[PDB]
UniProtKB/Swiss-Prot annotation, chain C:
GO molecular-function terms, A-Z: ATP binding; phosphoribosylformylglycinamidine synthase activity
Oligomeric and partner information: Homodimer or homotetramer. Part of the FGAM synthase complex composed of 1 PurL, 1 PurQ and 2 PurS subunits.
Protein name, per record: Phosphoribosylformylglycinamidine synthase subunit PurS
Function statement: Part of the phosphoribosylformylglycinamidine synthase complex involved in the purines biosynthetic pathway. Catalyzes the ATP-dependent conversion of formylglycinamide ribonucleotide (FGAR) and glutamine to yield formylglycinamidine ribonucleotide (FGAM) and glutamate. The FGAM synthase complex is composed of three subunits. PurQ produces an ammonia molecule by converting glutamine to glutamate. PurL transfers the ammonia molecule to FGAR to form FGAM in an ATP-dependent manner.
Pfam families: PurS
Disruption phenotype: Cells lacking this gene show a purine auxotrophic phenotype and an accumulation of FGAR due to defective FGAM synthetase activity.
Coiled coil start-end: none
Organism: Bacillus subtilis (strain 168)
Top-level taxonomic group: Bacteria
EC number(s) on file: 6.3.5.3
UniProt pathway: Purine metabolism; IMP biosynthesis via de novo pathway; 5-amino-1-(5-phospho-D-ribosyl)imidazole from N(2)-formyl-N(1)-(5-phospho-D-ribosyl)glycinamide: step 1/2
A GO cellular component entry from the record: cytoplasm
Reactions accelerated catalytically: N(2)-formyl-N(1)-(5-phospho-beta-D-ribosyl)glycinamide + L-glutamine + ATP + H2O = 2-formamido-N(1)-(5-O-phospho-beta-D-ribosyl)acetamidine + L-glutamate + ADP + phosphate + H(+)
GO biological process: 'de novo' IMP biosynthetic process
Amino acid sequence: MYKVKVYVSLKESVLDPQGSAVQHALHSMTYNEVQDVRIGKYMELTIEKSDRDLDVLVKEMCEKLLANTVIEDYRYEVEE
Amino acid sequence: MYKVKVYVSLKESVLDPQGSAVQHALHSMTYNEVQDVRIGKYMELTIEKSDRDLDVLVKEMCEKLLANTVIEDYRYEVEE
Amino acid sequence: MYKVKVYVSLKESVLDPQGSAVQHALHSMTYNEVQDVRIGKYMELTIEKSDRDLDVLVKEMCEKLLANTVIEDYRYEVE
Amino acid sequence: MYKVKVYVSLKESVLDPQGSAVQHALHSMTYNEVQDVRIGKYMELTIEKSDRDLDVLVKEMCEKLLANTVIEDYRYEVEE
């Protein structure tokens, strides 16, 4: 069947307090050449396949659960 | 400037309670064609080339903070 | 619009002289730490909203042009 | 060991003749929803770990062989 990977990232225009806290921790570890950190979501979905189209299925699952379209962009991969 | 995306997931010999809660959530929405859900971390770093080897720098950050080497695996991407 | 990236690669069970030539070339350039080289195909397509299923579209485009289903594997991305 | 993938494509300020040919064939196959086609190179390399920095290594292999510095762009992926 299908192995779909969905990547979710906060649109550039939005701020990321968690990513900044991490960056700070990295500076706290002397890894001070990290001028900025961004934290997103990564998902591996093993999809069978029903009377529903692959693109519609993934877009629906993304557009309403896996992601919050007013703060995060996404892209996805597929391989059988 | 190097853009460094790190992808951490969880060994395949490790359960993913978080992924399960999601599969269940997706099924309740009729997306019953999801056989499994693994949830991972995606991180975009912005590095300013220093006196430290890039591969050395990335390996250390992942191994010491970004990815728990005991229950997770990782890979990364580099771009200028 | 769909920015779509398909990746065609020779199956592991197939030999790749081109890759082995490039690897040799590298060795000549003193990079002997390269124990192997595989050369694949990278296509970046822009697809408009179609009445057809994206996965279905790509599979067909590969099976009959972008990929020789006899010696190559593929995968793809969508944005 | 290191599985290294280098992705060379062609700068966007350059035409992709090889792609237009591909686009045409697809349109002839009736797949007219194809608005454009850019073709690139995919390369999987297995590299022994050395004192050398992967980034430097890759950068160099590209500047002199894998990728034409004048008309192409590259990025890469690393996994142990």
